[PDB]
Structure 1
C-alpha cells in the first residue's frame, strides 16, 4: 500500500446534486502537477478556485 495523498484545485463548479443536493461535482486540478482533471463530488461549501484535500485520486465519481 503506497499512500498518494494529492492536493488539488477546483477550476469550475459543475453542479450540486446527487442525494438531496448535498454533494457537489467539480473538475479539480492538482496545483502542483497540472495533470488529470479528476471530476469528483464533494460535500460542503466550495469556493471559486479554492484549495482541496484528497485521499485517492482514482475515482472520476461521475453521474453514477
Structure 2
C-alpha cells in the first residue's frame, strides 16, 4: 500500500549528475523505521515524503 512519511536528516546528494538527494526517512505511524530513500527534487529537513513501495532501499545509481 501507499505510505506517508517524514524527513529526519538529509544525508548527501548522490546520482549520476547529482540530481538525487539521499534522505533519512521516518514514517508517520509513530514508527521507529528510519528508512533511507532516493528523492529527486529540492528537499530540506522536515519534509513530508509520500512513497508508493515503502520497503525499498537506498542505493547509489
Bin of the TM-score, shorter chain as denominator length: 0.7 to 0.9
Counterpart position of 1:21: 18
State the TM-score, normalized to the length of structure 1: 0.82
Equivalenced residues, count: 61
Structure 2 segments unaligned to the other structure (5+ residues): none
Shift of 1:45: 0.5
The CA RMSD over aligned residues, in Å, is 1.4
Aligned equivalents of 2:55, 2:45: Cα separation in 1: 23
1:4-57 Cα distance to aligned partner (Å, 9 max, x none): 100000100000111101001111001223232110110000021111111001
When structure 1 is superposed on structure 2, of 8-17 and 33-42 the one drifting more is: 33-42
Higher strand share: 2
